[PDB]
Structure formats: C-alpha cells, structure tokens
Design a protein around this ligand. Structure first.
Ligand SMILES: [Ca+2]
Length: 86
C-alpha cells in the first residue's frame, strides 16, 4: 500500500475497516470488479453516514486518484470526509 495512504488508514479501527469494506462491496460485482465509479463514490460514502458535496467529490478524485475508485482510495476519501463533520 502507498505510504501516505497509511496516514489515513491508520486512523480507522478494525471494526470501521470491516464495515466500510462491506459497504464498498455492495457497489461492485465482486467476482469481476475492484472499483466503483465516481457517482457511486458519493453513494457509498452516504451509506456510511457521510455527506460529501459534488465539488468535494471531484476534488477528492483529483487529489487521491492514483473516473474510478478502488477500495484503498475509498478508505482515504472516507477518512478525509469523516474529518469535515461539524
Ligand atoms: Ca461498529
């Protein structure tokens, strides 16, 4: 895994990582596919209680993308968004 991504992922509990993977898995044909689309990214995040805005999703795709989001990118984006709660 990318070392910076570890900055983010180390913030997650094991319970969180498992919950987040189960949510991500809803949005892929797991037998064939490892990424969700950029529209689905907002959906999985919202499934986990986050509410990213449309500008934010594009920014996150610009900054964290290594169109498509794999599981570790998704985790980093979750961590980012988790930190904008008020
Ligand atoms: Ca839990």
């Amino acid at each position: 895994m990318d070392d910076i991504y570890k900055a983010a992922v180390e913030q997650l509990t094991e319970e969180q990582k498992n919950e987040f993977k189960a949510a991500f898995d809803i949005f892929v044909q797991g037998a064939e596919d490892g990424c969700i689309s950029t529209k689905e990214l907002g959906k999985v995040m919202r499934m986990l209680g986050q509410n990213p805005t449309p500008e934010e999703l594009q920014e996150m795709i610009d900054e964290v993308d290594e169109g498509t989001v794999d599981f570790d990118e998704f985790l980093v984006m979750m961590v980012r968004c988790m930190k904008d709660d008020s």
